[PDB]
């Protein structure tokens, strides 16, 4: 009785799901074969108003690239079922000599910050950041890649081609802002000289400085290393110390503080003919995040990558309320169980022998 279930769910109505094609009810309108078997969610949820999901996209992808969806949503209990649309399969790197593994590190770091913060805020959206700059130099796309037909163009941060090496930006309208602070790092292939980059973000009001300089560390491959800062509203200066100037173009806008409420994350991966990664699992740690996964390959019924029975079974928990969320699963009832809930959230059952 009341064994922990391998589902994502909620204690009440106040939840929100962020997703991709597997949760995107509108995607049926752009398919030849018009039914919902491409979704891992129950289509009854299409009318809930509790989903922000876009076919072919992910939070990381909309954060960094021109192929942008305005993920927006508010709830107490936040659930993510996305990530697959930026994986080693997609194969992104800024340059020929680049390195997808760097971008996997970036993905892990981004989601670490996002999941942690969404345990403390109800509301997420993505906002544009504008800047002022007293030079003639303009933005250049120096990070882009073609793979699997599709061309991906990074547009966050902005690169200012060559020279004033600072720019002002304002963060306003949110409690906190997730922005990327990035430098190119690595050696040029033909020369084997390490690329020289520097990037500082300075808060004019507080005097606090975050910086990142390139180093000579063996990481063969030259590519963009990003760290993800959670900043407060204010006036900032972006400073590159006479090297390549970057400035944020987009931020995750965090609003409406809440008492600590763990997020739930569902493993987002391709069928095994495509290479996936475990970056979101690295990001999803206790006590702020519960991770859910099946024990089998993703075997889609619509096509290989869409409509899996195991993942449909995990997402099925959004159709009902549970008493308690925990490391090992969700407990439907609040009274007794055969196992002790670990790191629980909710009204949680006991596993004692009731006398």
Ligand X SMILES: *[C@@H]1O[C@H](CO)[C@@H](O[C@@H]2O[C@H](CO)[C@@H](O)[C@H](O)[C@H]2NC(C)=O)[C@H](O)[C@H]1NC(C)=O
Ligand Y SMILES: *[C@@H]1O[C@H](CO)[C@@H](O[C@@H]2O[C@H](CO)[C@@H](O[C@@H]3O[C@H](CO[C@H]4O[C@H](CO)[C@@H](O)[C@H](O)[C@@H]4O)[C@@H](O)[C@H](O[C@H]4O[C@H](CO)[C@@H](O)[C@H](O)[C@@H]4O)[C@@H]3O)[C@H](O)[C@H]2NC(C)=O)[C@H](O)[C@H]1NC(C)=O
Ligand Z SMILES: *[C@@H]1O[C@H](CO)[C@@H](O[C@@H]2O[C@H](CO)[C@@H](O[C@@H]3O[C@H](CO[C@H]4O[C@H](CO[C@H]5O[C@H](CO)[C@@H](O)[C@H](O)[C@@H]5O[C@H]5O[C@H](CO)[C@@H](O)[C@H](O)[C@@H]5O)[C@@H](O)[C@H](O[C@H]5O[C@H](CO)[C@@H](O)[C@H](O)[C@@H]5O)[C@@H]4O)[C@@H](O)[C@H](O[C@H]4O[C@H](CO)[C@@H](O)[C@H](O)[C@@H]4O)[C@@H]3O)[C@H](O)[C@H]2NC(C)=O)[C@H](O)[C@H]1NC(C)=O
As annotated, the active-site residues are: 21, 303, 306
Residue 88: closest CA among 273, 301, 299, 303: 273
Q: Confirm or reject binding of residue 219 to ligand Z (CB under 6 A).
A: no
237 binds, among ligand Z, Na ion, ligand Y, none (CB under 5 to 8 A by kind): none
Residue with smaller CB distance to ligand Y, 264 or 294:
294
Residue with smaller CB distance to ligand X, 44 or 303:
44
Residue 335: closest CA among 321, 323, 345: 323
Looking at beta carbons, which pairs linking 288-291 to residues 24 or more positions away fall under 8 Å? 288/115, 288/116, 288/119, 288/260, 288/262, 288/263, 289/115, 289/116, 289/119, 289/262, 289/263, 289/264, 289/265, 290/262, 290/263, 290/264, 290/265, 290/325, 290/326, 290/327, 291/265, 291/267
Q: Confirm or reject binding of residue 134 to ligand Y (CB under 6 A).
A: no
The span from the CA of 148 to the CA of 162, in Å, is 32
Residue with smaller CB distance to a second copy, 161 or 287:
287
Interface residue with ligand NAG among 132, 190, 217, 295 (CB under 6 A) is 132
CB of 353 to ligand NAG, least distance (A): 7
Site for ligand Z in 267-296 (CB under 6 A): 278, 281-282
The span from the CA of 94 to the CA of 64, in Å, is 12
Q: Confirm or reject binding of residue 133 to ligand NAG (CB under 6 A).
A: yes
The span from the CA of 301 to the CA of 311, in Å, is 12
CB of 82 to ligand Y, least distance (A): 14
Q: What would the x/- binding string for ligand NAG be over residues 59 to 88, using CB under 6 A?
A: -----------x-x----------------
The residues, ordered by sequence, that sit 6+ positions from 255 with a Cβ below 8 Å of its Cβ are 121, 122, 123, 125, 174, 175
Question: What are the structure tokens assigned to 347, written together?
Answer: 């009204």
Query: Which strands, in side-by-side order, build the sheet including 15-19?
Result: 51-53, 15-19, 77-81, 263-266, 289-292
The span from the CA of 79 to the CA of 228, in Å, is 21
CB of 37 to ligand X, least distance (A): 21
Q: Confirm or reject binding of residue 267 to ligand Y (CB under 6 A).
A: yes
Residues forming contacts to ligand X in the complex (CB under 6 A) are 12-13, 66, 70, 72, 125-128, 132-134, 168, 173, 196, 198, 200, 202, 204, 209, 213, 239, 241-243, 267, 272, 278, 281, 293-297, 320-321, 333, 335-336, 354-355
Residues forming contacts to ligand Y in the complex (CB under 6 A) are 267, 272, 278, 281, 293-297
Residues forming contacts to ligand Z in the complex (CB under 6 A) are 278, 281-282
Residues forming contacts to Na ion in the complex (CB under 5 A) are 197, 199, 240, 244, 246
Residues forming contacts to ligand NAG in the complex (CB under 6 A) are 12-13, 70, 72, 125-128, 132-134, 168, 204, 278, 281-282, 320-321, 333, 335-336, 354-355
């Amino acid at each position: 009785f009341n064994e922990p279930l391998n589902v994502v769910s909620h204690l009440n109505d106040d939840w929100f799901l962020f997703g991709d094609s597997r949760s995107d009810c509108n995607h049926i309108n752009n398919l030849s074969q018009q039914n919902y078997n491409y979704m891992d969610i129950n289509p009854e949820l299409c009318k809930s108003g509790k989903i922000s999901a876009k076919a072919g996209n992910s939070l990381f992808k909309s954060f960094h690239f021109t192929d942008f969806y305005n993920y927006t949503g508010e709830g107490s209990q936040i659930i993510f079922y996305e990530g697959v649309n930026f994986t080693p399969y997609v194969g992104f790197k800024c340059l020929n000599n680049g390195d997808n593994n760097r971008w996997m590190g970036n993905k892990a770091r981004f989601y670490t910050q996002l999941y942690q913060k969404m345990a403390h805020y109800r509301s997420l959206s993505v906002i544009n950041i504008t800047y002022t700059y007293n030079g003639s130099a303009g933005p250049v796309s120096m990070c882009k890649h073609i793979a699997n037909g599709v061309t991906l163009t990074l547009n966050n941060p902005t690169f200012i081609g060559k020279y004033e090496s600072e720019a002002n930006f304002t963060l306003q309208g949110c409690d906190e802002f997730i922005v990327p602070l990035c430098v190119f790092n690595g050696q040029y292939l033909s020369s084997k000289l390490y690329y020289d980059d520097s990037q500082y973000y300075y808060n004019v009001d507080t005097g606090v400085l975050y910086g990142f300089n390139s180093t000579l560390n063996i990481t063969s491959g030259l590519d963009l290393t990003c760290i993800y800062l959670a900043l407060t509203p204010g006036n900032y200066i972006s400073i590159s110390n006479e090297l390549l100037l970057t400035v944020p173009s987009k931020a995750i806008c965090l609003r409406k503080p809440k008492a600590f409420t763990p997020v739930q994350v569902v493993d987002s991966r391709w069928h095994s003919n495509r290479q996936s990664d475990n970056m979101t699992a690295i990001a999803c740690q206790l006590p702020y995040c519960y991770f859910r996964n099946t024990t089998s390959d993703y075997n889609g019924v619509y096509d290989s990558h869409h409509g899996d029975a195991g993942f449909t079974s995990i997402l099925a928990g959004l159709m009902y309320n549970v008493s308690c969320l925990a490391q090992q699963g969700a407990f439907v009832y609040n009274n007794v169980s055969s196992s002790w809930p670990q790191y629980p959230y909710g009204h949680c059952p006991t596993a004692a022998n009731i006398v």
